[PDB]
Subunit: 120 residues, 3 copies
């Protein structure tokens, strides 16, 4: 599952589009078909979000979990794509975007009654 964190005031009305944008970059960048992944939104109240001092209220954190296996370039590509999509499609400046890809071996994944190393 992918999670997007942000101040509720700014993130709340941006949900549908951020989902479309991520589903787009996952497809276009990793060939994962749209809707294949779960996407969650966490809308923060002001007092819970201490974003970095030099950033703005649009500060958006994206956590992406993948089964380990891809090349660094492919991972870098999705990060660059995500920045572009956010800038040109939501007005969120790369400045205010933070992203992290977390990977775990296939055998640490479980979906559809199977472990990931056994999915075929």
């Amino acid at each position: 599952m992918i999670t997007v964190f942000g101040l509720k005031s700014k993130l709340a009305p941006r949900r549908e589009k951020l989902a479309e944008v991520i589903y787009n970059s996952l497809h276009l960048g990793l060939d994962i078909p749209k809707g294949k992944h779960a996407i969650r939104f966490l809308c923060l109240e002001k007092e819970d979000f201490y974003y970095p001092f030099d950033r703005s209220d649009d500060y958006t954190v994206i956590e992406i979990n993948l089964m380990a296996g891809r090349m660094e370039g492919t991972k870098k590509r999705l990060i660059k794509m995500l920045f572009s999509e956010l800038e040109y499609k939501l007005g969120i400046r790369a400045h205010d975007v933070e992203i992290t890809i977390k990977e775990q071996p296939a055998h640490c994944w479980g979906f559809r009654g199977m472990t990931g190393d056994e999915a075929r």
Copy 2:
């Protein structure tokens, strides 16, 4: 800490039983005593949960964090048991569950004042 993510209407009512099942499979499958582990539940509002298109409102994500060291087979067993247990006790179709085990080096953990590598 282990986190369970699910849609509020479906997850809230099952909170108590899921903790038992998780404590049960942690105990039963890894030897961790009913309650040595923190378990958190995050109840999502519908607008915040884009589970995979073709799944149901019963979609439940489980994130499990452990100190590294167990063998691959041990971790698969845990995932496998969690699938069975949630099927039989909660009636959650395995197709509706996603699980990921995240592991971190012992020295990256902290509990009861020590670093994980120092413990006992």
Copy 3:
């Protein structure tokens, strides 16, 4: 992003002192200037927080995400400094504190339009 999880009744009044302490340990332990990292708080309802049964409702979990690279002893320092700070400055006993440092390769990070390895 670093996240701090705790019972809302105990965590909410602690947020500011808690951010200061994390910024302080990150600066002294890792040389990271205050305010460079985002800190998030997740205030829990009693119903959602099954902390271990022999623990107390002060139970606090801290997840720290770092770009891989630092030395093992540095990571350990940071953890030990955080136990100090929280107990002696917030009164939260080290037994009621769980911490985990999660590291990802620089190429897995993205900020200010760049990837961490760039």
